[model samples]
Target: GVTAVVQKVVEACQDESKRLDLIEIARSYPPNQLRNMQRTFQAITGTFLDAFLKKHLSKDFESLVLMLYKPRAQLLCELIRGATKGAGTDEKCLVDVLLTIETHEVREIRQLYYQLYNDSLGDVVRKDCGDKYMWAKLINAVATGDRIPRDTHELEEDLVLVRKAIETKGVKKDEVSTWIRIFATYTRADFRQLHKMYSAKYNGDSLRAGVEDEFQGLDEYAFKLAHDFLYDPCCAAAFSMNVAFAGSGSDSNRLNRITAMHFRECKGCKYYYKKVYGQAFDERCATELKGVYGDAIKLLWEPVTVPLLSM
Candidate 1:
């Protein structure tokens, strides 16, 4: 099986136009299988598959394939490092990569980051986020891997703290940290329940809406990013896709990054995206992206078919 896939890979790499045919091989296999095929190809050709593609491919298409080829943690650590080392920090990148996952996964990422980069992930982000106090606190909390499961009493008190903080005419600087503390410290299940209770008790205004009402500027965006990913990941997945294709020219890097970060988790996301956006996920890719890139994204991100029993 590996030999067959490796042969197709070689053939696809030989012809420029037929390069897209690689997706035919790619989509047919799961990620683990694809990794095996890469190893087999490297053994046969004496070139890493990613390096081979780099020699042949350029621009967004090259980025997409290379990202797909990397291990997720390694890619994320690279992304984090790249986002921070640049002249201006890619704040959105920092938030998306760091805050969008579980505590344990964040812990794993931090470990891999040190193993790969030989520096503290938290320190790097802290230096980059300097003077942006709310973002600093939120990122610091996430970097610590410190979310704890809370009891009903604690959750209710958190809600009370949030209510008093936001109830003020203009939430003070300290109040914003309170919001960040609650957001960064609660487990996902507890946070979801807290938001639900916040909405029902506060005239159907969601916690995100509360953040919008009280916070301003980057802090608002940072809080919303945390809320979107942690509360309804399907919503966050769809939102990232929409953000990728929203403007005049598509954000190729964002497109590649979000798809790489999210594609594996997007089984039910297509239906949710369709219900809210009135466009299916693959349909949007086919329309917005060009030629081979469009087709590749469609093949890779196509909605998973639900079983009859599940339906």
Candidate 2:
């Protein structure tokens, strides 16, 4: 069954004149075969299935494709259609694409979406995708424009707030609760400034303590994500390198080794080593406390170094 159907689609792909016939084939295939057909089409065409559909089909044909698969592909197809139309296209499609891109699950595709469109894909998606999804607000914050902090004063203000939060007494639970609420609601407020200011002010030593003191046990990973995004150059470099090395196993391994060596020797990681455990990284290695899992350690250390880092 598979062989016969595969042969049909392969033949269709090779025959330019039979392209429309392939759509008919796609329409007629059993559901499982149709999914395979879509994947085969994507592979053979060297383009996303939705993109291919946009170029070939009439509106009515597109609607037929929608009947074959609901939501995901259909929504994506709608986005492709909107992008092609000059203006006055439906915004919902754009929103759906952008919202999908915002998810950590689809984080890798963010750049791909941008590459296909000559615009801020995130911004357009935010504008078009209605804020119905519960995580929509978080996505909006994450997709906030690439404007980096311009001045240390802004960073300083964040530091002051963090310090004030840390210094607040008695109603500490209420303080942290309020802070989280503020962070969630004031999505655009720059947490990176606070992180950068913390790094600059305390040189990353007591920053974690300050974080623990101010917002203990409250989505520590989320806080670290925000902090790394703002203040950590080494983390930034490491992230860029990781993205660059993606799909190249050897390259990624080599970089991981280099990062471990750098962490063992570099002033920044060394400072982190001293601050977090009150001991040197090299000494830890000598005592068999050093981690063999370099990549995992890097990720663990990354939050400290970069804090709330983002793409």
Candidate 3:
């Protein structure tokens, strides 16, 4: 199967017009399998697939295809590095990259970032955060990935603690610390259950309300982003697409990153997007984008089925 993909890749690379064929072929395989195909392609042809694609492809098309070959953690490391390096940090990008992913994935991304760049992801982000001390500490804590596993028996106890932690009148530093510690300590699944308990107790006023009432500015937004992501990642995925294209022009970096790196998860987000945004994912792509870049994105939104192999 890998050999067949390698030959097809060669055939697609032979003609510039066959670029869409490359995208199509790429979309047909899962990312892990495609990485395996990359290794196989290199072994057989004495050229890395990414290098070949770079020569054949250009601009966003090339970026989209190259993203397919990256290990998830390595790709995230690149995103984190890019977000932190410039004259001013991209705090939004930092929140999206660092907070939206899983604890284990964050742990791996931090490990890979240190391995690849000889820098700690947590310290880099903390420095970039600058005066936002609590937010920095929150992000640093999250970077540790030391989340408590889900505990059914502890739900009521957590509920009481959260009520005490969040019942404060304003953005008291101590109360905010309590909130951050809870989030940093609890697993995503545990938070999900805790929110259900909070919602039931408080007449469906979500964790978002608590966050909004307590904090202000970027800190508020960042924590809310984390809360929304934890509550329902698919919904968060859809929300991100809406955010990227809702304004004048597009957030090209975000569009490319989400589609190329996480398309497998986001492809099913069409229904969720439409439910929230009143537009289908493909329709938005059609309206907001054009040319090969748009074509590649649409191709990515198409779902692929991988047959299981048993030996």
Candidate 4:
């Protein structure tokens, strides 16, 4: 059925050179069929229909594109489920579609696993689905508020108890460990307030003091690396190189290939290579690394665009 719908939509596009007629055909299609058609069109044309949709449809339709198609489908399913249960038809709550993108999809999904579980989706996932796999299934549950749990009161009480323990003086590693566990558990513990309270009780800021005192077994090079990043320019450059290159020993070939790719894509990094090493990235890689890598570089810089034409 969807294949037939896709064929019809494609045929319409091919026959009708007018953009308006193509958009009309797109709007007339059923939602699921429309989504598949749009995907097919994008594949064929190498361009998205977002601008056309925005010009013709409501802002909600535009948001559907911005959030990407997968999450948008989840949101529609939520609406249908609610409608089947005779819930009030308040489409304004559809703005949660965008919030889902902001909170779960971007913040939690893209970050480091520890950061994802400890900070962003921590409390919600912990309460709803204790197991990691089930928690993952609920990533698209942003519409139901089912992902968020009812443990705020318990978390608050635990935080107060931890603060009291810290106030008792000569707090040991066990106490700090307990506090770190609480921090890891509660997503909304307000670390700023905890820091202020800890400073009042212990005569030093908790975070800064912890960093200074807790890290151990630092040799001269480690100390120099840390201090240079803080104070010296040349040290900062060296630190950046170490960050980019130091961990490559575990998978040297893979890292070299990835870095070469980055050098190819990033203009600034390429310029830096030429200035520092007195040769272009490609030339240097060929001679030194024995031509084992590609000329691809991952560009990390933000893009700058200016409007060239106005309607």
Most accurate candidate by TM-score = 1
- Candidate 4, residues 66-174, lDDT tens digits: the string is 2222323343333323322343532212211212232343333424423423433333333433322211222223322321232545545655666554455444545
Mind sharing the TM-score for model 1? 0.87
Tell me model 2's lDDT, rounded to 2 decimals. Answer: 0.42
Candidate 4 regions with alpha-carbon error over 4 angstroms: 1-42, 45-177, 208-311
Candidate 2 least-lDDT 10 residues: 302-311
- TM-score for each predicted model, relative to the true structure: 0.87, 0.31, 0.82, 0.26
Which window of ten consecutive residues has the lowest lDDT sum in model 1? Answer: 302-311
Candidate 2 stretches greater than 4 Å from native: 1-111, 114-140, 150-156, 169-205, 216-218, 233-311
For model 3, the run of ten residues with the poorest summed lDDT? 302-311
Model 1 pairs in collision: none
Off by over 4 Å in 1: 15-21, 24-33, 86-88, 131-133, 167-171, 216-218, 305-311
Tens digits of per-residue lDDT for model 2, 208-295: 5554554432133334333333345344334323332345232323333224223221336545545545765445433432223322
lDDT of 3: 0.75
lDDT of 2 at 133: 37
In terms of lDDT, the best-performing candidate is 1
